[PDB]
């Protein structure tokens, strides 16, 4: 036979070694990262990402540094599709919220529209 049939849910929360507080009380976020509007390049809007909620950063009294207690504060995971991220978050027991992929709609670009006859879209200078 050399196979079994597991009808139950794929769940590995007892195996990862993560404490319970960083399983149930966190909120994973599954999102295509938004385009840095400083830059027209769109290679940062390709792959899905999973972050978590940002917990407390406080002042270190010695140096003024950003001390923190959240271990998962720097954990940003990369997933090629959305449902892989959803299956990964269901697999680890993380409660997740999903933003959809915001794509720009195609615009009607016309260079002659800058020099129309009766339309308002004449440019005032070039």
């Amino acid at each position: 036979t050399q196979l079994i049939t597991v009808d139950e849910k794929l769940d590995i929360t007892t195996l990862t070694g993560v404490p319970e507080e960083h399983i149930k009380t966190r909120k994973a976020r599954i999102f295509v990262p938004a385009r840095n509007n400083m830059q027209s390049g769109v290679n940062n809007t390709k792959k899905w990402k999973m972050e978590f909620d940002t917990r407390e950063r406080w002042e270190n009294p010695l140096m003024g540094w950003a001390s923190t207690a959240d271990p998962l504060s720097n954990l940003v995971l990369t997933f090629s599709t959305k449902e892989d991220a959803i299956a990964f978050a269901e697999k680890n027991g993380w409660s997740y919220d999903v933003e959809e992929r915001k794509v720009p709609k195609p615009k009607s670009k016309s260079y002659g529209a800058n020099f129309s006859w009766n339309k308002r879209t004449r440019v005032s200078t070039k």
């Binding site: 597991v6 139950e8 769940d11 590995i12 007892t14 195996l15 009380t25 407390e56």
Partner: protein, 114 residues
């Protein structure tokens, strides 16, 4: 839904392996209190073994509980052989940590964590 097992074909053999592991830990605990010369009683160590087994009493997947039995026997191999020390055994007793606020009101009083 056809996956490959580890040791157990279903939940009954898996519970058999959990039960043999519990038998082995229950035999091991008096020697663990003795040779490590811990400062707890034997009954307190058996209570901690009971708590660590009841922590994972919710899983209905045979591969996950097979891996839990494998990891528990690795813990037992590191316990029978003196590979762990007094510190690694007493890490199961979260003693130096303060008890965390459990109710909403004291968590509201001390911090931002829900």
């Amino acid at each position: 839904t056809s996956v490959k097992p580890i040791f157990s074909r279903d939940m009954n053999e898996a519970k058999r392996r959990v039960r043999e592991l519990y038998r082995a830990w229950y035999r091991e605990v008096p020697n663990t209190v003795h040779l490590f010369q811990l400062d707890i009683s034997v009954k307190q160590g058996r209570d901690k073994v009971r708590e660590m087994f009841k922590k994972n009493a919710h899983v209905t997947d045979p591969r996950v509980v097979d891996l839990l039995v494998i990891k528990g026997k690795m813990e037992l191999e590191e316990t029978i052989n003196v590979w762990k020390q007094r510190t690694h055994v007493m890490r199961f007793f979260h003693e130096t940590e303060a008890p965390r606020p459990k109710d909403f009101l004291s968590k509201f009083y001390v911090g931002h964590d829900p």
